[PDB]
Structure formats: structure tokens, C-alpha cells
Design a binder for this molecule. Structure first.
Ligand code: HEC
Ligand code: HEC
Ligand SMILES: [Cl-]
Lengths: 131, 133
């Protein structure tokens, strides 16, 4: 059903509101959404981003501090989604081939939004994330 | 949850299977439960780069049986895959690789890594599409 990590570490039991853009819009995500997103993160991302780290480039982690230091900041659903569709360097000036680009054939919009939600929520509230 | 369907239907192992344990013709007996455990370890630790037997960051060095057997020395036995994972090497074996995931004994025990090697080895042999990407 719902993952206990989402219960325990993300502190979500029903729903949660997350920033979609820099404009002021939010989107509601359920606990099952964040559970699905956690699973997608395990299948596609965790091997390089264990615990919110970035093993092949420790300065550019998935911590909220590091996401907010990116150009543009990677602290919203829309900016995280846009990033995975075409990964970029930290200053955003060059294409990066070190992280995993995800096509719409691989993850649909809905799926990638759950992944971004899991990462954004974990960045905001999970103990130890990005350490 | 005891034996996963993928192992029955795609690895074609219901009871046991015999896999090359070393280069001198010796095999070791793995059960369907062993391969299920190895699959789970692969899904948890290796799948971002090696989904379906591919190698996303270097597709020329995949988990296909062809590519495994062409490594130096060949990576087509339990012992050779375990030794690889403990300290990953380049394809010709002359240099240390930092592009794959080294697995310390603190991460996976000998037996666990054996079951992961067995999963990869059986998949390479019989799983439809494995490594052909
Ligand atoms: C290893 C091969 C990786 C996998 C698999 C995934 N990512 Fe990654 N990511 C990786 C590196 C080496 C980097 C640094 C990139 C650079 O060129 O600077 C990243 C970066 C990110 C970031 C940006 C973090 C920041 O502080 O700005 C994000 C948000 C990110 N990665 C997400 C991500 C997701 C969701 C993945 C699963 C689909 C994923 N990455 C896979 C290395 C690797
Ligand atoms: C991405 C970050 C990887 C993860 C996670 C794992 N592997 Fe890997 N592997 C990766 C690369 C880029 C390469 C090519 C290496 C080179 O220097 O030539 C490999 C290679 C292997 C091999 C050898 C394949 C061959 O044809 O000889 C094996 C057996 C292998 N990888 C297994 C493996 C396992 C079991 C992992 C999970 C524990 C794993 N890899 C993670 C990239 C990445
Ligand atoms: Cl891993």
C-alpha cells in the first residue's frame, strides 16, 4: 500500500502540497503518489543518489540547499521535471550526460511528477537526506 | 514472495539450476529462491545502469553473455562476477574502473553477491532480450 518511509520520514499520511513553479501555484500529492515516486526513485535513481547524495558529484546533491543553488533553482515540480527530461550542468549552461535523462516513453508526466514530488518532499523534511 | 514469476517464466528455473562456478568446468547448484533473491539485489543496487542487461553509461560493455565472455578474464562464472563486483576493472582487465558500482563486504556478503552473480549469469544465458539494446 503506502510505504512506511513516506509515513515515517516524509511525514505524509493523506496529502501534501508542493511548489509547482516560482509563480505561486501548488499541487496536491497523496501518500500513495509519494510511494510510487519512491519506487521510481529506487528503480531509476537511487544507485547514484543513495540517501539524497550524488555519488559521482558530491557538491551537486539532492539536498534542498544544493537544489536551490542550481541555475535555475531545482526546488519545484516543474523545474525538477524539466531537468529530468533534459539534464544540465549545475549552472545550467551545458547539457549533462552524467545523470539519467528520462524520456516520456520511459516515464509519463504523471510518473515523473510523483518522482519529483518524492525528491522535493524528502529534500524538505527527511532526516539525513543529502548528507 | 518466495519465488518471483520472472524467475519461473523468464529464467526458466522452477527447482534448481547448475551454474559455472569457475573456469574448470565446475558448477554450483542454485535454487529458484536463490535467483529470486539475486534478482531483488539487482533491482535494488544495479538497475539504474543495467536495466534489462544493458549498460547505460557504456553500452559496448553490457551484461549480455557475449560481452561477459569477452571480458579479460571472462565474466561468465560465479567466481569471476563476484571478484569483479568487489573491485570493478576495465574490460581488458588492465585498469581499475570507477564507472560501475563497487560492492564492499559491508554492503553485500559473499553469499548475497553469489546470488546476484547467479541471477546475472542465468539471465544472460536464457532471459529474452537481456543485453540486446
Ligand atoms: C548516475 C549515473 C546517476 C543516475 C542514475 C541519476 N543521476 Fe541525477 N545526477 C547525477 C550526477 C553525476 C549529477 C550531477 C550533474 C551535473 O552535471 O552537474 C546529477 C544531478 C542530478 C540533479 C541535480 C541536483 C542539484 O543539486 O542540482 C537532480 C535533481 C537529479 N540528478 C535527479 C535524478 C533523478 C530524479 C534520477 C532518476 C531518474 C537520477 N538523477 C538518476 C548522476 C545520476
Ligand atoms: C552505473 C552507475 C552503474 C551501476 C549502478 C552499476 N554498474 Fe556495472 N557497469 C557500469 C559500467 C559503466 C560498466 C562498464 C565498465 C568498464 O569500465 O568497461 C559496468 C560493467 C559491469 C559489468 C561487466 C560487464 C561486461 O560486459 O564485462 C558487470 C558484471 C557489472 N557492471 C555488474 C554490476 C552489478 C552487479 C551492479 C549492481 C551491484 C552494477 N554493475 C552497478 C555501470 C554501473
Ligand atoms: Cl547501489
Amino acid at each position: 500500500g503506502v510505504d512506511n518511509y513516506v509515513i515515517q520520514y516524509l511525514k505524509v499520511t493523506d496529502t501534501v502540497e508542493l511548489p509547482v513553479n516560482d509563480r505561486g501555484e501548488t499541487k496536491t500529492f497523496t501518500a500513495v503518489d509519494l510511494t510510487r515516486g519512491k519506487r521510481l526513485f529506487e528503480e531509476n535513481c537511487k544507485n547514484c543518489h543513495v540517501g539524497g547524495s550524488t555519488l559521482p558529484n558530491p557538491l551537486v546533491s539532492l539536498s534542498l540547499k544544493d537544489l536551490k543553488g542550481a541555475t535555475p533553482p531545482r526546488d519545484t515540480i516543474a523545474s525538477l521535471v524539466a531537468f529530468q527530461r533534459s539534464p544540465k550542468s549545475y549552472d545550467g549552461s551545458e547539457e549533462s550526460y552524467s545523470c539519467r535523462r528520462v524520456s516520456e516513453d520511459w516515464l509519463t508526466t504523471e510518473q515523473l511528477e510523483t518522482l519529483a514530488a518524492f525528491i522535493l518532499r524528502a529534500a524538505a523534511v527527511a532526516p539525513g537526506w543529502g548528507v
